[PDB]
Structure formats: C-alpha cells, structure tokens
C-alpha cells in the first residue's frame, strides 16, 4: 500500500502512504478573478475517514473553487483529477465570505454551482482568540456552492471557546438570509462540559465547566487522537450534533488523526468521569 506526494509548487515524489492513512488524496484550489484565472495542486496521503469535497466560495468579483478527492488504490494522484470540465450549470446558491467580510456586510451574491449535487451552505468558523498564532486562517464565515462530507442537512459543534458549523440543502437560495452568529441560535436546553488541553491543565477536572449548548447541537461530544505537529495526549469537550459522532467531520476541521468520538444523551454526560 502506497501513494504520491506533491507539493504546491509540486515537487513530484512519493511516500509509503505511511500507515495510519491508506488514502491518497488529491487536493485543489481554483481562483478566478475577472477574465484571468489561477490554480493549485497538493497530492499526499490522508486518513481513511476522508471523502471527496468541493465548496466554491465567492469573495466578491473573485471566486474560489476549492475541492479534494480520494482514492486508496496504490498510486492514484499523479496527473489529473476529475471539452469542458464544468459541463453545464447546475443548482443556484448564494455565496460570500469573511475574506472581505463578504458574508458579514450583506453583499451576498448569486453564484452558480459548477456541478449539480453541489449545494447551498452557510459554513461557520469562529475561534476564541488564539490557539496557536492567533488561530487557523479559515474565514469566520463562508457561504456558497459545494459538497461537504455528510453535508446533506446540517451539522457542527460548539462550546465556550470554539464554534464550528455547517449548513446545506438542495433548495435554490436555501442558505440566504442572515449570518449564523451562534449567540443568535436558540437554547437547546442541554447542559454540558467544555474544555481544551492536555490530560491535565488543558482538560482537567478544574477548567472544565458547565455551559449552555445552543442550537441543534443537543448532543454532548468528546474526542481524542493526535493533533497538530505531533503533540498527542489531546482531547475536546462540547455540545454538538449527530454528525460529529458518526465518522468525524470533527477530524477534518480540528485537524487530528485517527481520533474517536463518543457522545451522551442526557446533559452533563460530558465529564471526563
């Protein structure tokens, strides 16, 4: 079992697809502004949990087609991906981002999908202040055409310090309207436990505290696996939805490897125990 490794520049060399990931993923970003237009390659190996994805976002007069694909077959990613690639124009949607504060200012624009199953989504990312450098560079908000894993319908997670979220649906103009602010959401009634950090002093019995979950995440979630640059012995706590329990859509977002989630019905099932 093996794969290919290509940088962004694309030094095209190989790997053993290591072990914990059997998956060769090809990863691509498409930028378009005015007439001219632009694009990007990363071929590497990625964990089993991963599945194909599109998500094109519109920042105003420039548009960003992201997208990624997986195969596990020894050695897929060299050459191409998968005469006009966007054949036709499929379902309509609204798109804007916090790149320019696009989704924030009411600038929502019409952006046709580049394919038929590609749908409307509000996807949301907040952070507290700083995890690392001031935290990951993903837009505090984004909306437009795509397909995200298990997107059909809705999903996400939350607690005192971090808010992630995902909306989507197959209806025209479904994502439109206001911006999901969290604090905007309703009171799900669930009582839970939030925390970040190591066995102790990140996550310990102390910092932990009771938080009111908001919105559709009435599920109390918790997770573990290795994190960014190999500081392991790491976990997370907070309310969320079914989504984050099956598979992990958590494993994409928080960026961690061969993690495992579990969740509990009645509130406060959250505690390290």
């Amino acid at each position, epitope marked *: 079992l093996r794969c290919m490794q290509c940088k962004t520049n694309g030094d095209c060399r190989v790997e053993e697809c290591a072990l914990g990931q059997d998956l060769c993923r090809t990863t691509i970003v498409r930028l378009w502004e005015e007439g001219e237009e632009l694009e990007l390659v990363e071929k590497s190996c990625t964990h089993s949990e991963k599945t194909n994805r599109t998500l094109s976002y519109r920042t105003g007069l420039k548009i960003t087609s992201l997208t990624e694909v997986v195969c596990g077959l020894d050695l897929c990613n060299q050459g191409n991906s998968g005469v006009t690639y966007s054949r036709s124009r499929y379902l309509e949607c609204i798109s804007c981002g916090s790149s320019d504060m696009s989704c924030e200012r009411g600038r929502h624009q019409s952006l046709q999908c580049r394919s038929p199953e590609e749908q409307c989504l509000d996807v949301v990312t907040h952070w507290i202040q700083e995890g690392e450098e001031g935290r990951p560079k993903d837009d505090r908000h984004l909306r437009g055409c795509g397909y995200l894993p298990g997107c059909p319908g809705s999903n996400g997670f939350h607690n005192n310090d971090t808010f992630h979220f995902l909306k989507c649906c197959n209806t025209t103009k479904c994502n439109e309207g206001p911006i999901l602010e969290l604090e905007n959401l309703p009171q799900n009634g669930r*009582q839970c*436990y939030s925390c970040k950090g190591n066995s102790t002093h990140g996550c310990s*019995s*102390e910092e*932990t*505290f*009771l938080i*009111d979950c908001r919105g559709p995440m009435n599920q109390c979630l918790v997770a573990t696996g290795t994190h960014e640059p190999k500081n392991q012995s790491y976990m997370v706590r907070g309310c969320a939805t079914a989504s984050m329990c099956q598979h992990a859509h958590l494993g994409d977002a928080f960026s961690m490897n061969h993690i495992d989630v579990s969740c*509990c*019905t*009645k*509130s*406060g*099932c*959250n*505690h390290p*125990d």
Partner: antibody
Amino acid sequence: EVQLQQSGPELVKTGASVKISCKASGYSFTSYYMHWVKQSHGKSLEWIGEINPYNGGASYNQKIKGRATFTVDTSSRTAYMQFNSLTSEDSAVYYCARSIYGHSVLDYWGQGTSVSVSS
Amino acid sequence: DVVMTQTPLTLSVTIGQPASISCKSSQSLLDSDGKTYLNWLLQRPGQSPKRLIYLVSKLDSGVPDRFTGSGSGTDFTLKISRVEAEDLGVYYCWQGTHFPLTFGAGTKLELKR
C-alpha cells in the same frame, strides 16, 4: 481544591425548624448537582436529595415528606437546606455532595452536619 | 427503592491481608444509558467520608490500585490485597442508578494487630 463546609452544629426544639448551610470553592459551582445524606443512628445511611444551580432542579426522596427545601445563592457559591417540622428519629448527621451533572452519583463531600432535637 | 446489602457486615483484616467485600442490589443497577453508577464510598473515622470508587471499577484520583472494583448484575465485588491502616474506617456501597439513591449497610473494617 474541592471544598465543602457546612454550618457547624445546631440544637432544635422538636416540631420546629432548622437552617444548615453548605459551602464551596473548588470549581465553577454552577457546574454541579448537590446532595444531602442522612447518616442516622450514627450508622444507617439514607439519601435526602439533589439540586442543581444552573437549571434549578430539586429532588426530594419520596419518604422525605417534603419537610425539606433545598435552595441556593449564586453569588455566594452556597447550598442551603431549609428543613421544617422536626423529630426524634430525625436526629442524625447530614452531609452534602456533588454529582455531577445529572446522573446522581457523588464524589466529594463536606465535613457534615450536627443535628439533633429534644426538650 | 432498591436494597443495598453488603457482606461481610463484620470484617477485620490483618495488614498485607486480602479484603473482599461484596454488595447486592434488588434489581439491576444499569441505567438506560448503558453504564452503571454503582459505587464505593468510605468514611475514615474522625474525618469526613470520601469517594473510593464509582462505576463499579473506576478509581478516584488519589486512589491507589490496591483496590479493585468488580461485579455486575445484582451482584458486585470489591478487592484489596495490601490492607493498611488508612483502610481503618467504615465501609459503605451506594448505587446512583435509581432515584432515590441507595446506601449499602456500613461494612466496618479493622486491622488485626
């Protein structure tokens, strides 16, 4: 440090009423369901109840006869027990503890409560 | 109201000696969540009581391995190899798996000298 400190001891004229505190520091108080346990006969052990700072729930054990009132202060980080009409069998040790959340099942306790009544 | 009945009710042990108490519950003690709250809480004399175990195995922070929790169903078992002077005190088992909560008897421990 998990800290539970009750009122000290109290004497009471039978049939009348008593108020016995419970204290804490050592957590976000709002974050745990509180209890009380009757230790009676210097021996036998029996559940009083639960109550729960955030949502404001209150349990009372069936046999209680609701002589009992849990209660709280959020600003004080404090549990109470208002516990009216009193008796001979009553006299015992009364402790409090944390669950928590929900799911009954305690961990840390406080010292206890010295409580008895007579003529 | 389930029954909490512990045995032996009368037990002295000698240091470095085996201590096995056993607790019983009328019905099961397993909540619709598929977990079991049954536990072990000790009162060490002249102090205030403290949680030795919960969840029928899982041990509190400053709790040493010398204790081992067990059992399932209507039956349960507690275990300690190295018995010591700390272990002098009173021994109670309670299940948080029904309201109202239940308390075992009070099995009492000594160290023979």
